[PDB]
Structure 1
Amino acid sequence: YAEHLMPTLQGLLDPESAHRLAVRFTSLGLLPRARFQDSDMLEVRVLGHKFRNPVGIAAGFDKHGEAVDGLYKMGFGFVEIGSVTPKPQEGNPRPRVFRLPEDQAVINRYGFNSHGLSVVEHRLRARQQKQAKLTEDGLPLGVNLGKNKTSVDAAEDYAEGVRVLGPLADYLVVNVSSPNTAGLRSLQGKAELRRLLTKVLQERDGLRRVHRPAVLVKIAPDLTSQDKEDIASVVKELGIDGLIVTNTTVSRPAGLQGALRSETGGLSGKPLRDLSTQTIREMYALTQGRVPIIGVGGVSSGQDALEKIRAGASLVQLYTALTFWGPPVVGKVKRELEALLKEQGFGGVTDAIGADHRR
């Protein structure tokens, strides 16, 4: 895979075609069931759920909820689908995703291509009780909500997503951090965020108890210090259940080598890694370690995962590493993380969460 398979599928196909085929293959279960059996050391209890291991698939890989079961088979401890927008929409014109192999990075400007809430609702309903069992067995499901390009009331878009997919999700994500929808990231500002999240939480609280998900906010890696302070304040004021830290970056860190480095879009993978880790670290401090963080950005190894956990993440996610290393990277991250936890004297993941802040 890392050397023998992915280079062929990568070089042979443009990245979007490769992704579509990967989703299809995954959905059909055409991957070996992951051999790595999860150690008890990797179990995490957070967000009202048991997570058999802390390595999830980040939003964007399975935008429309087509490959959830195949992703659990790949070894992910939790699956996040989306972003899902209220109405179907096509996203931006192609090409809209670009590989930067020399940087182990991707730039994407999909623009919330989405089958829409109704289609995803019916897809998740078809496996709703299967998911209930998976969740009880430590394999929760997150649903990441977006807003339509032409929406005239962003908060209502997210409210609709809460109402339609909230009952099918263990947690929901208010994605206010895509770089590829005009104006979306302004919803991270204090006043807009408070109003938006108040409405989202009211809608969530109006769901029946067994259908009431945790609500997390997914934030950018490009926030000012003021933005981060404001988000932390709003999250604590409103009782937001957690943060996902981070989405892709609109920055272009010095040193990128890929020919496509100046394409518009969000940058993911290795050049984002430490920017994301530092955002986790700051958000954990600003929330006094009381707000669960799902850490994401440039995770391709156990060390990458543990750095985010020690910075304050209770769980991590990855996407871009899968595009370069294929399915074996999941077990690799988990095996490496277990080894490092043992080496560094942690009894398990839980003991390592935020450990850097206690040094």
Structure 2
Amino acid sequence: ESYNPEFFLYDIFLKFCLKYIDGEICHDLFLLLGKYNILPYDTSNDSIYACTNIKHLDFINPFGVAAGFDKNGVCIDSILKLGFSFIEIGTITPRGQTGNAKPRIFRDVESRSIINSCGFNNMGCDKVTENLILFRKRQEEDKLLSKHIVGVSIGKNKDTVNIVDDLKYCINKIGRYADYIAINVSSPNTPGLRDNQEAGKLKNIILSVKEEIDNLEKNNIMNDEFLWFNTTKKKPLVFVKLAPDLNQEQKKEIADVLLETNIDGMIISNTTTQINDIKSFENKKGGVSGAKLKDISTKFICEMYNYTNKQIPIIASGGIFSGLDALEKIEAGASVCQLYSCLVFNGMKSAVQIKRELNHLLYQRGYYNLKEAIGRKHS
């Protein structure tokens, strides 16, 4: 039963690969398998009591795959069929980029931590749009994917002067195929990008992105071909992805801007540059993921949930491995969870296992459904 994601051999390979094989090389191999549809798949029916929503986005379960896992959208079907309800492809930029010099991704099995300085390696918005279009055409005839959601994370080329130009370019090309757009102002690996989390800069960025999406709708809704070729059949929602490396004053000013601009959600959070007690990383560059980011991002969720007076839905990212980790994120304020590091260290069985653990937890904790648990830490 090689098709079962819990098949015993997959973990044996994984322990070997995390020990002896370059991290990005391992990731390249996974992506190439997905193209040929030979990966295992999860055929379990998800519990309707663990579904969740952000506005009209109806997630069949609360676990998606975070951005940067399938940067080019070449592996969408196979990753989703592992048991995930959505994936955020990207981050994409208008032109392609090879990113920073390799090797640039390292993992620490002991601490379940990753450090990376990728630098927005992607094929560029136009080619990734073609990859997403192909998925959307497959989705239209594969009824078993008709409720899965795909968001697109968008950013800037390294040498772009005005970030807004690049975000508008991505909207006008790929926006009609996305269920949501994630604005990436939090990668630690593009010089200057995090400066755009300043309140005035962030406000202009959000308003510009929304205006570009609204103009896309205004200018094309009369067309014969239906504009929204996505899961929702609606214009994409807009999220912002924030960095955990901010002081309390910045978080509050950002929260005020999010309230004024009517952002549809905030992804909390990106990788951190403040962890340096991990010896095998100590002469390394970039952002840190995994278990050592869990507490950092969970507290950040609590702060932003309260700073935005619970008016802005939260997408949790950071150190989520277990059902209990996920429940901490949800009770802290998140409506839905994204995984990355869990996949690297737990492998093919990641979504089957975390969904089963979370279901058992909702039972033990006396919740009727998952939505009941959202923000319950603050009750």
TM interval, shorter chain, is: over 0.9
Count of aligned pairs: 356
- Are residue 76 (structure 1) and residue 84 (structure 2) matched? yes
Residue 270 of structure 1 aligns with an amino acid whose one-letter code is A
5+ long unaligned stretches in structure 1: none
Using the alignment, how far apart are the partners of 1:27 and 1:57 within structure 2?
A: 17
The alignment partner of 2:171 has SS state of helix
> 1:273·1:298 contact (CA, 8 Å) conserved in 2?
yes
1:1-45 Cα offsets, whole Å, 9 max, x none, are 685220112233211111101111233222222143211111112
Using the alignment, how far apart are the partners of 2:371 and 2:132 within structure 1?
A: 30
Match of 2:57 in 1: 49
Given candidates 185, 203, 207, the residue that maps to 1:198 is 207
> 1:134·1:140 contact (CA, 8 Å) conserved in 2?
no
Match of 1:185 in 2: 194
Using the alignment, how far apart are the partners of 2:164 and 2:143 within structure 1?
A: 31
- Are residue 103 (structure 1) and residue 103 (structure 2) matched? no
Match of 2:268 in 1: 245
Match of 1:263 in 2: 284
Using the alignment, how far apart are the partners of 1:203 and 1:151 within structure 2?
A: 18
1:331-358 Cα offsets, whole Å, 9 max, x none, are 1111101111111111111111111111
Given candidates 121, 132, 153, the residue that maps to 2:129 is 121
> 1:29·1:73 contact (CA, 8 Å) conserved in 2?
no
- Are residue 315 (structure 1) and residue 336 (structure 2) matched? yes
1:36-61 Cα offsets, whole Å, 9 max, x none, are 32111111122322110010000011
Match of 1:26 in 2: 34
Matched ranges for 1:275-294 at <5 A? 275-294=296-315
Given candidates 173, 183, 191, the residue that maps to 1:164 is 173
1:250-282 Cα offsets, whole Å, 9 max, x none, are 11164x3x4124411000000001111111111
The alignment partner of 1:314 has SS state of strand
Given candidates 199, 208, 217, the residue that maps to 2:240 is 217
What RMSD over aligned residues (CA atoms) do the two structures have, in Å? Answer: 1.7
1:264-304 Cα offsets, whole Å, 9 max, x none, are 10000000011111111111111121211100101111011
Using the alignment, how far apart are the partners of 2:145 and 2:307 within structure 1?
A: 32
Using the alignment, how far apart are the partners of 2:143 and 2:263 within structure 1?
A: 25
1:117-161 Cα offsets, whole Å, 9 max, x none, are 000111111232444677984311110001100101111111111
Give the superposition deviation at 1:324. 1.0
The alignment partner of 1:87 has SS state of coil
Give the superposition deviation at 1:103. 1.1
Cα distance, 1:157–1:70 mapped onto 2, change above 3 Å: same
The alignment partner of 1:223 has SS state of coil
Residue 97 of structure 1 aligns with an amino acid whose one-letter code is I
Using the alignment, how far apart are the partners of 1:352 and 1:50 within structure 2?
A: 17
Cα distance, 1:350–1:112 mapped onto 2, change above 3 Å: same
Given candidates 313, 316, 332, the residue that maps to 1:295 is 316
Match of 1:341 in 2: 362
Match of 1:36 in 2: 44
Cα distance, 1:55–1:261 mapped onto 2, change above 3 Å: farther
The alignment partner of 1:295 has SS state of strand
How many percent identity over aligned positions? 40
Give the superposition deviation at 1:165. 1.3
The alignment partner of 1:180 has SS state of coil
Residue 105 of structure 1 aligns with an amino acid whose one-letter code is S
Using the alignment, how far apart are the partners of 2:67 and 2:144 within structure 1?
A: 18
Q: TM-score, normalised by structure 1?
A: 0.95
Cα distance, 1:65–1:136 mapped onto 2, change above 3 Å: closer
> 1:49·1:138 contact (CA, 8 Å) conserved in 2?
no
Residue 353 of structure 2 aligns with an amino acid whose one-letter code is K
1:98-119 Cα offsets, whole Å, 9 max, x none, are 1112210000000000100000
The alignment partner of 1:127 has SS state of helix
